Amino acid sequence: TKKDRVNHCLTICENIVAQSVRNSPEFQKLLGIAMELFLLCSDDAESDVRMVADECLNKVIKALMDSNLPRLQLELYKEIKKNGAPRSLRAALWRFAELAHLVRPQKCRPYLVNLLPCLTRTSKRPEESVQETLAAAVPKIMASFGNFANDNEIKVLLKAFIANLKSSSPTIRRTAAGSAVSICQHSRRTQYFYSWLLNVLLGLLVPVEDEHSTLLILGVLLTLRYLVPLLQVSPSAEQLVQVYELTLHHTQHQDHNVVTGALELLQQLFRTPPPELLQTLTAVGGIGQLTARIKGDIGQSTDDDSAPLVHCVRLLSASFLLTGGKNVLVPDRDVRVSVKALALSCVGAAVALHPESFFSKLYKVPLDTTEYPEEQYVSDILNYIDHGDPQVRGATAILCGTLICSILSRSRFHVGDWMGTIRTLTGNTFSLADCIPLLRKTLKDESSVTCKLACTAVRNCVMSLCSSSYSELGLQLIIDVLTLRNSSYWLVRTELLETLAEIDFRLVSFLEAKAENLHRGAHHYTGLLKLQERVLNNVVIHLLGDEDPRVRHVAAASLIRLVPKLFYKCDQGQADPVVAVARDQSSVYLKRIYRGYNLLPSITDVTMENNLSRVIAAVSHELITSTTRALTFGCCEALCLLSTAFPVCIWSLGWHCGVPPLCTVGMATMILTLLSSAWFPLDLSAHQDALILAGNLLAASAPKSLRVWPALGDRALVPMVEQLFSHLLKVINICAHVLDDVAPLGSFYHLPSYLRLHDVLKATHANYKVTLDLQNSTEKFGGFLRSALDVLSQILELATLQDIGKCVEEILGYLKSCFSREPMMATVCVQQLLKTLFGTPGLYHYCFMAPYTHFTQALADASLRLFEPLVIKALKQYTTTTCVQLQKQVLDLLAQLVQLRVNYCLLDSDQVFIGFVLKQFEYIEVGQFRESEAIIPNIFFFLVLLSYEIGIPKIIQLCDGIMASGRKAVTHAIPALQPIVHDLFVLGKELETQKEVVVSMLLRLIQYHQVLEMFILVLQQCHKENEDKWKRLSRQIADIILPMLAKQQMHIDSHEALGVLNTLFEILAPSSLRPVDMLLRSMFVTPNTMASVSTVQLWISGILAILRVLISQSTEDIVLSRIQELSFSPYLISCTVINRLRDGDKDWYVHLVKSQCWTRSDSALLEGAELVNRIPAEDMNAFMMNSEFNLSLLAPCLSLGMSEISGGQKSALFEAAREVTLARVSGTVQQLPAVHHVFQPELPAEPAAYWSKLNDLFGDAALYQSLPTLARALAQYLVVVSKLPSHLHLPPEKEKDIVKFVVATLEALSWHLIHEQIPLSLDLQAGLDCCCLALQLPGLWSVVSSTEFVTHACSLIHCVHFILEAVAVQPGEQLLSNPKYITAACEMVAEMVESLQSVLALGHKRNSGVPAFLTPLLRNIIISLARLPLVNSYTRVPPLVWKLGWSPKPGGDFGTAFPEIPVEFLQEKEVFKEFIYRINTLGWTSRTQFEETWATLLGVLRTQINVLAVQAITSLVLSAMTVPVAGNPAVSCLEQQPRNKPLKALDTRFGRKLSIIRGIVEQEIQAMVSKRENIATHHLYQAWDPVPSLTTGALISHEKLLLQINPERELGSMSYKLGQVSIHSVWLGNSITPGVDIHSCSQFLLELYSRWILTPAILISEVVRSLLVVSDLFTERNQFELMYVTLTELRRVHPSEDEILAQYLVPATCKAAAVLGMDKAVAEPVSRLLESTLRSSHLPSRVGALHGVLYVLECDLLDDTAKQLIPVISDYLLSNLKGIAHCVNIHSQQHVLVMCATAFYLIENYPLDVGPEFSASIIQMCGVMLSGSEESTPSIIYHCALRGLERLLLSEQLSRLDAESLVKLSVDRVNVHSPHRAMAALGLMLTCMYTGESVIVAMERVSVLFDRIRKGFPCEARVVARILPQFLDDFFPPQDIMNKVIGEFLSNQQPYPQFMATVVYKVFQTLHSTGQSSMVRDWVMLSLSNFTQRAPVAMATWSLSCFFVSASTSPWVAAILPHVISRMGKLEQVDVNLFCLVATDFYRHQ
């Protein structure tokens, strides 16, 4: 039945696994019985039976390590106690060590007690096969069952194994020695049990002159080779020196098995020495202080005057390998060559310890000069290079390696001076010139065992020579190893490349330039000796192409060690090779997204990015141009080890090659073509390294690309991500059908390419399930399944819900089968899916000048649910596993189900999982837990985050147990509080008591430098919360740590440790460091003893970190006054004190213009200003600056010379009249007295007789007349400053005298109201315009603020409160219902700002008293005076505070410098509504005052005050959004962006003519039609639109954005109206396309408004509205993605019928999807929400939903199916215009205005997506509305639908029949009566003629312009006379233009020819072109006949003189016409003489 016995064992195995039913009361009985029967199959003796049925028992265990582990391990302990056959007991003992680390620590302590009776019987067994496997289980069992035993159980077990050293078998001697030493690593006390094994063994060799049973001598020396590796009460320093004398007697005790036993013990105690033993041998006296074949006086190891390591080399040589007479070999007959091999390796490991031994004499007393001629030294050790075999010539190859390694490190590379001292002491002649040619020879040796040992000698020896004086010989040994690259022994080639990885090839390139003979060398070569390109192209990349899997892996790790060490020539950092070595030695001595990628700005070394881009150039070249299988295969393994040490996201400029050509996608296009071949994935050793490297190269595009697969946003990048996500779902599809035996989107059935991949994952899985070996790193399926769930993770971050929404079904099925094999990184696949299913330089720079200036810059700053089946399975694993890499990834999966609020239903009835985390705190304190270190930071993050739903009272009692009762702090106690402190201090009366508890615990723990990072968090919140509490706490830790720094209790051993303590004294409050009594007693101290470098090192770190305080925090003056009092003697550490511690008509024209200028006053001002122009311009000041020039001819002289500059050439009008204006300003202030006193209208003469001078030099009625004529002068000059060149700005020296003159003209205004009357009340208006502009300029406003002008800034407050009170405040009222004058100026400004609510608001019931031309002027001037630093601190205090008890002292070197208001007053609503008024209309100042108001509002964040402070945070960001000064509502207003592009119809030669004509028409509209929100003053051409340029730039003027402004807005009215930042302007300031840190304030607001949504229904509505306004200021594609996620989870939860909340979120959700891609997963949620709200009955809900149409329709090329839902929005627009065609007054205003603005945006940009019938019918609905009456359709509805009609014509989109419908409607509206209505209709008549019988139809349009002169107001017909000169010259020739003008000039129905006189003048002088200047003459003849039929006789002669002027000579007749048309009637004798002169120069002109 021998073949019948085989079939029985194998059928029992398969019917247990295929049950699929475990933990059953039927299944429990079956597994016990037939489990003992698997080993009787092995107990039966046949190799056909023994081999077959032992691999079958391993199929049961591994399929049941998850399910039934406690049932498996109970049957198995029974068999050892049975103590069966030596074949039966053996193969069960393999099984029980591998399942020892699978037990739980709950059940472990019963398993320990039962084994020690069972583990002693198998130690007493003499079977030599049973004893072997126990030395491979007592390593594994007692390391996991180690910690659970006391001191009683482990002393019994070690007395047994020593009685197994008393046996004679060589197999049984070495298994009892490795059992004693594996326990003491894990016993209970690792250091206590090392000292106990050394006492037991030396009594077995107590005094050595005995008979010691020479088998038992070998038992004691083998337990000591295993324990000396572990020695590095304690094992004492006198216990270890008894070990060492024991062996030197036993290197002499004769045997060949006992001589070889004490020579392996000596080779290992020098390599890894115990540090107590190591100092007693190098010391000079050595053993003499601890006590208080050879034929000469050696001198034993007790003697002084020589080290014992000088002694120990004399002894091992003359007995083994040297004869004391002559340089001669010892024969191999005497000493074996196994015994001569271990004696050459012990002489080499001591020279690395004590190098002076090798130069010593062999005998101390010389040996018999009669017999021997000469005595020799120990240099005949180096004659064993010629001795025979390997490992003697190879172990004298390694004796010359560490003799050169350890002279250079002994004497610091001084091989000159150190060799002199020895030669006069021991007279040998042995230089290092006689050993390197002994080392150059063994590299060339024959045997491949001799070559392995000579190339480890160059690992030690060529980093010490090459930087030494012998670096001529040091470079040659670099050369010879390069010839050893092609020898055919696989261990010879991998110890080459480690001595080519430790090379510093920046120090190696330096020696090449110095060489001249070494480049030649042998055979006289010519050229360069290129080491670097030959050692990198022809070894390291070349040895990647080797055949062995051993040689390919070691060559990758060198390119991790070579890249920081290259030095390629001529970088833009290091230039020379001299400067290269200097930068690697100055950094040494002078100082949650997934793991793949990065979003930082990524500061990087510029020259370290250059060495990493030359090693990825030659590596992608032996992967593409390679011809072998072996070059492609082991160079995908060298690219996966770069990207885990030099990641791609950090070093992207090195990895970049090509793709996106600029954050990179480097080289990832080749490697996908390797994987898609059917050749390369068929072997799992390097297909798993090509998947970890293709996920690093598609993730470095994540900081660029992100704004199918809609989040990729780069269509050249999508096929690289479509492929891997197709490649990684077909490799989790072949790992699902393999772990479960099932026959063969992700699908590999129909591919024949991936049916080859199913036979390769099934060969590596038949060797795991058959061979039980749990602890393997390399498994190639367990290594391969780790690689393809790591990179399925990193792609899902790029994915969205819309791409994965068809695959959440797919990826969850595979992981339930992929869970059991590797659950550690199968939840890292599950941790990420839930994120994206829920949305989420020249050697003076380097050595000194670059590190010297990081020093001084930080000192000035020191002066300052398908988861429900998968989620339940992961919780059963944590209770039953034991590997603590898996316990760490399960505590992060549950901190994400509580943030993303999954309800606490994972434990539906009980509290099963939370009860198990409390028990694990029992095993850490006692220490019955194996790897608590890697779980204790993540245990405590799970616990604190649940309590916001175990409470924070209970959480902090658990952490107090670990610290005082448990292990050390730097693993357990200090990472325990990093989750608590960050989640308690950063994020009422219950919260105050728990903060006192946590600060007391750290004071017990200050000693550690990781505890000092937690305490920089504590000090930065008290400076923010409460500055009274901030200074109390920095005093308590002042007198703790400075007593520690003198007694050196502070662990500052690291340079991670000195960096934490110096950022502490900056942030510690300077009041606690201001007495220098404490810092000096902690400074000038002496430590206890400076013998040890543990204690020398902590005393010099206390002196370096309290000296960073005496340099910054206190200057030189304070420090040295103290030491005169404190007797700190300079003999503190002196050379006597430091020693005991270490041991212990040219001129005719000039006269005519004088008649109206040198006069008193005239009305000729616009006519007077033109005559001064053509004065010959070389002389203005001679003809303007005179005795009496009219100063009312000087201020309108400034306005006309600006219009020349705004278009063209520089103006002689405007340049020379800036010189005249500012000279008269100075002399009146020179007429003012010297020292100014403040004006006081209440008590004027009571101060002094200063006011006596002020009425005679200033109070003259002749000097008063100038002050309103000099007051119009400075009004027009300060306006144009925003648009003048730099020649024309006001001078800096004349800047003081324009500040002093605003003060002096506003005090002449207050001086008439007292005495005479009002000044003139136009002179009320001219004097307060000089004052409104000096407060808007950045130059003039700064001078008013300084200390010199306290009198001049408090006198504009007394005199603007005197003009506002003497006009508005009727007698017997008020406005609303230090020296004295400063606080009488400070109380004055508080009263005026409360009036802007009531008094000065434009149109209030209280505003009937102010005459409403000052409510523009006096509203802008009360704002800019309370921005002064004299005043501003008091004005922000609301008036309910001063009734309460708040009055601190002011000091700022001024009057009032009050601190800001504390939070406790703001907790009342009436007190809180008045503080928010003072901050918006007032703005802010320099940027320090912006962050003061930010901290006061957040502490407010009872629900009546939660509502009103979310609205206060909206208004603070917008004053950082303003385009000028940004924080001043006086000057400026909010920036807006046109969503209409600039036009195409301009920029042609006919098109540049289009832009001049409609410049004149639009500009006098805004003087009539518009609202002046921007403009305070009364001046005319104030056209100012704050559209910026865009990274912002200059400001765009109003004439350049001619038709940019959107039709949603009233003319010029600047406010928020939902369209401020259009998504055109998001993408080109923040480059994303699918002074305040304003970026800082917008990240903090995304965290706050999501936790309130995910609050009462009052607070639901006002939180969605604050987030839509700040959306102007989101500056990143990371920031727009978080906005869209929070708004969609609301709608499914919050009810649909909340129609306040419904109309803020439809504007909110739609502006996200525009900056985001409007993709197929985004369109279907965004398109459905716009359709429903337009059906709502709530009329302001209709209006917010229509702005969301625009942003979707605006920029993104919209999806083709979703643009068929534009006929959803097209149909709504037709229905509500036919009802609001006739009547607009009835229905609405801003529902009628916003709805016609989006009709115009469809016809231009998106024509074809709507019908052609829809375009022509929006034209017709603006006929009925624009031809309505002046009350049927309002003026605001009129002007906005009409500006959009001339937009569509300039766009070239409209048809030829569609365009002429607009032509007819514009004719009928010019003849309506209202001219502001009729000024806009004239602009439409131009554009139709400017987009286009030809002679005939143009006759009708021209005569429409001529009638508006006749009928029409003179505010209208100024516009018509500027155009019609320029208008007629362009269209039709001047023979036809001439007939209509004069016949409509001479007519009796001409109401005034005055404005018709300017029309005829500009025609002729363009007709004075050379072709038509004579045709000018013919038309003069016909018009003279018409005058003979007469007008009235005074009137008829006036028209004659105007005509001949316009047709005359050039220089002087042409300038007479404004002097002629000045006097129209009123004939004079002076009038008769002027007619004669003009028409006679024409008689000589013919």
Side-chain angles (χ1 to χ4, degrees), residues 382-690:
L382 287 171
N383 288 319
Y384 286 162
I385 292 172
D386 298 331
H387 178 271
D389 58 345
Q391 296 177 359
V392 174
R393 67 176 69 186
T396 54
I398 203 169
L399 188 273
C400 186
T402 66
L403 182 274
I404 302 170
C405 180
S406 177
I407 293 173
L408 295 165
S409 178
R410 176 74 176 177
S411 68
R412 268 74 182 174
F413 297 174
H414 296 287
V415 193
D417 199 4
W418 193 67
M419 288 292 169
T421 61
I422 292 173
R423 189 179 178 91
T424 60
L425 193 275
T426 62
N428 53 359
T429 62
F430 179 75
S431 179
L432 271 69
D434 287 332
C435 202
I436 299 171
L438 272 65
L439 194 148
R440 188 184 293 167
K441 180 171 69 176
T442 57
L443 294 177
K444 294 177 183 178
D445 201 80
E446 292 89 6
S447 296
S448 296
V449 186
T450 63
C451 290
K452 181 179 74 70
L453 296 174
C455 193
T456 59
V458 196
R459 192 176 66 190
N460 306 320
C461 187
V462 76
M463 277 303 295
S464 297
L465 284 172
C466 192
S467 64
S468 174
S469 63
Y470 284 163
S471 65
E472 179 176 359
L473 296 174
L475 200 281
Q476 192 61 250
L477 291 179
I478 298 171
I479 295 171
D480 290 331
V481 178
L482 269 284
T483 64
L484 193 141
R485 67 180 180 267
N486 55 4
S487 63
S488 178
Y489 188 71
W490 69 275
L491 288 167
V492 175
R493 288 177 296 179
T494 60
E495 286 174 350
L496 174 147
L497 184 147
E498 292 177 351
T499 76
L500 294 176
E502 293 184 355
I503 307 300
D504 48 354
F505 289 104
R506 61 181 59 192
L507 200 148
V508 171
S509 182
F510 170 70
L511 283 173
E512 298 179 357
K514 291 175 71 67
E516 292 88 5
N517 295 115
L518 187 61
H519 288 284
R520 295 176 180 175
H523 70 271
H524 296 285
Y525 177 75
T526 180
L528 290 177
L529 192 142
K530 291 187 285 186
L531 279 170
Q532 186 173 1
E533 288 93 7
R534 193 173 72 196
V535 79
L536 197 278
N537 285 316
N538 299 117
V539 174
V540 177
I541 296 171
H542 178 72
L543 291 180
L544 296 177
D546 195 75
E547 296 91 5
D548 288 327
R550 280 84 49 86
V551 182
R552 292 198 299 270
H553 178 76
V554 184
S558 178
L559 290 182
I560 308 166
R561 292 179 183 175
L562 284 173
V563 175
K565 296 177 184 179
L566 285 174
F567 183 67
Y568 276 151
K569 184 67 70 177
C570 289
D571 287 327
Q572 59 186 357
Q574 52 186 358
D576 285 334
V578 176
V579 194
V581 184
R583 73 175 293 171
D584 271 339
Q585 296 183 358
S586 180
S587 67
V588 175
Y589 299 108
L590 290 175
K591 284 180 177 178
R592 180 180 290 171
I593 59 173
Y594 196 69
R595 68 174 178 86
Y597 61 95
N598 193 3
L599 281 80
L600 268 69
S602 181
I603 44 96
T604 319
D605 197 359
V606 180
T607 72
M608 185 58 206
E609 286 179 350
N610 291 325
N611 291 321
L612 189 271
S613 178
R614 269 74 170 266
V615 181
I616 303 174
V619 156
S620 178
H621 186 73
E622 273 79 1
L623 187 148
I624 298 170
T625 68
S626 66
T627 62
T628 63
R629 175 172 284 175
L631 273 168
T632 68
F633 187 70
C635 194
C636 293
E637 289 183 355
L639 282 168
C640 187
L641 291 175
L642 293 176
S643 179
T644 64
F646 291 152
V648 183
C649 62
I650 303 170
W651 300 91
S652 69
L653 296 176
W655 283 86
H656 182 269
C657 54
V659 203
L662 54 91
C663 61
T664 71
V665 182
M667 194 258 288
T669 315
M670 178 60 205
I671 294 171
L672 301 177
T673 63
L674 291 180
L675 302 181
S676 69
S677 65
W679 162 64
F680 188 74
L682 286 176
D683 40 4
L684 300 165
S685 64
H687 180 263
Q688 64 94 28
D689 282 332

Side-chain angles (χ1 to χ4, degrees), residues 280-332:
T280 62
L281 297 178
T282 310
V284 179
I287 302 172
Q289 281 76 243
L290 294 174
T291 190
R293 288 173 290 175
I294 58 171
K295 56 182 179 291
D297 192 3
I298 296 170
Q300 290 83 16
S301 65
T302 309
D303 293 331
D304 294 331
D305 294 330
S306 67
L309 285 175
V310 182
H311 164 72
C312 287
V313 179
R314 293 178 180 176
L315 186 275
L316 193 144
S317 181
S319 179
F320 291 161
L321 66 148
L322 198 145
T323 299
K326 187 257 183 65
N327 45 0
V328 63
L329 282 75
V330 293
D332 294 331

Side-chain angles (χ1 to χ4, degrees), residues 942-964:
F942 172 68
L943 288 174
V944 67
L945 194 274
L946 184 63
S947 66
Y948 288 167
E949 292 183 351
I950 296 169
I952 318 167
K954 288 179 94 289
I955 298 167
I956 314 169
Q957 285 185 355
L958 296 173
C959 187
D960 199 4
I962 304 173
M963 192 179 297

Side-chain angles (χ1 to χ4, degrees), residues 1044-1111:
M1044 289 180 182
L1045 289 174
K1047 297 175 176 65
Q1048 291 87 25
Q1049 297 181 359
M1050 185 58 61
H1051 301 287
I1052 318 169
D1053 192 76
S1054 296
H1055 190 71
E1056 294 177 354
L1058 268 180
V1060 181
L1061 199 145
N1062 288 320
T1063 63
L1064 194 278
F1065 293 119
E1066 300 185 358
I1067 302 174
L1068 200 152
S1071 68
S1072 298
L1073 299 175
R1074 186 67 57 83
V1076 198
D1077 286 326
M1078 195 67 202
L1079 296 170
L1080 296 176
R1081 292 181 181 178
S1082 177
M1083 179 69 78
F1084 290 158
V1085 289
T1086 304
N1088 294 319
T1089 54
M1090 58 179 70
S1092 179
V1093 200
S1094 180
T1095 314
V1096 182
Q1097 183 179 355
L1098 294 177
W1099 173 60
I1100 310 171
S1101 70
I1103 299 174
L1104 264 293
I1106 314 171
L1107 192 145
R1108 194 181 179 272
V1109 185
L1110 304 176
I1111 290 173

Side-chain angles (χ1 to χ4, degrees), residues 51-221:
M51 289 299 292
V52 166
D54 180 73
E55 292 178 351
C56 191
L57 188 273
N58 298 118
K59 289 182 181 179
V60 175
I61 308 298
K62 189 170 289 295
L64 295 177
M65 288 192 287
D66 192 2
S67 182
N68 291 114
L69 200 276
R71 183 63 177 169
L72 278 177
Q73 285 175 353
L74 197 146
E75 299 293 327
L76 288 179
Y77 173 68
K78 291 179 181 178
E79 289 190 358
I80 296 177
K81 188 183 289 293
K82 286 181 180 178
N83 201 4
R87 289 182 182 177
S88 179
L89 188 145
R90 177 184 179 273
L93 197 273
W94 287 349
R95 268 69 169 171
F96 304 164
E98 303 292 329
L99 301 176
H101 69 274
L102 260 289
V103 307
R104 292 173 62 188
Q106 183 177 1
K107 296 178 182 179
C108 65
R109 180 63 179 172
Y111 282 112
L112 194 147
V113 183
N114 288 113
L115 264 292
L116 294 178
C118 292
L119 280 172
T120 55
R121 298 179 184 176
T122 58
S123 66
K124 297 178 183 179
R125 176 171 288 173
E127 183 71 26
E128 295 182 355
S129 177
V130 176
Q131 290 292 328
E132 194 273 331
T133 61
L134 190 145
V138 176
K140 292 178 177 67
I141 293 170
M142 294 300 292
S144 63
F145 289 108
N147 296 315
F148 300 135
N150 213 170
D151 200 3
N152 291 317
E153 292 87 3
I154 291 177
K155 281 184 181 179
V156 179
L157 200 278
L158 293 175
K159 293 180 183 179
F161 280 92
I162 299 172
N164 287 322
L165 276 316
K166 292 183 175 67
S167 296
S168 68
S169 178
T171 62
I172 203 170
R173 285 180 296 167
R174 71 183 66 189
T175 62
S179 171
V181 190
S182 177
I183 298 168
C184 298
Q185 294 180 359
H186 310 93
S187 175
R188 179 61 177 268
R189 291 176 288 173
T190 66
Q191 286 297 110
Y192 174 71
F193 277 93
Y194 288 157
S195 177
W196 185 72
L197 283 180
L198 286 177
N199 289 319
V200 179
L201 298 175
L202 303 178
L204 302 174
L205 288 87
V206 78
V208 302
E209 297 294 326
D210 288 328
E211 293 180 354
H212 291 284
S213 178
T214 63
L215 297 174
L216 193 148
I217 304 175
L218 289 176
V220 175
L221 295 174

Side-chain angles (χ1 to χ4, degrees), residues 10 74 77-78 114 118 362 398 514 552 601 828 869 980 1088 1158 1253 1310 1398 1451 1617 1877 1954 1959 1981 1984 2009:
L10 192 147
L74 197 146
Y77 173 68
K78 291 179 181 178
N114 288 113
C118 292
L362 193 275
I398 203 169
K514 291 175 71 67
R552 292 198 299 270
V828 184
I980 291 172
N1088 294 319
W1158 282 265
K1253 299 282 102 175
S1310 64
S1398 295
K1617 204 175 262 78
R1877 295 290 184 92
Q1954 184 70 40
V1959 175
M1981 298 299 289
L1984 286 172
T2009 190

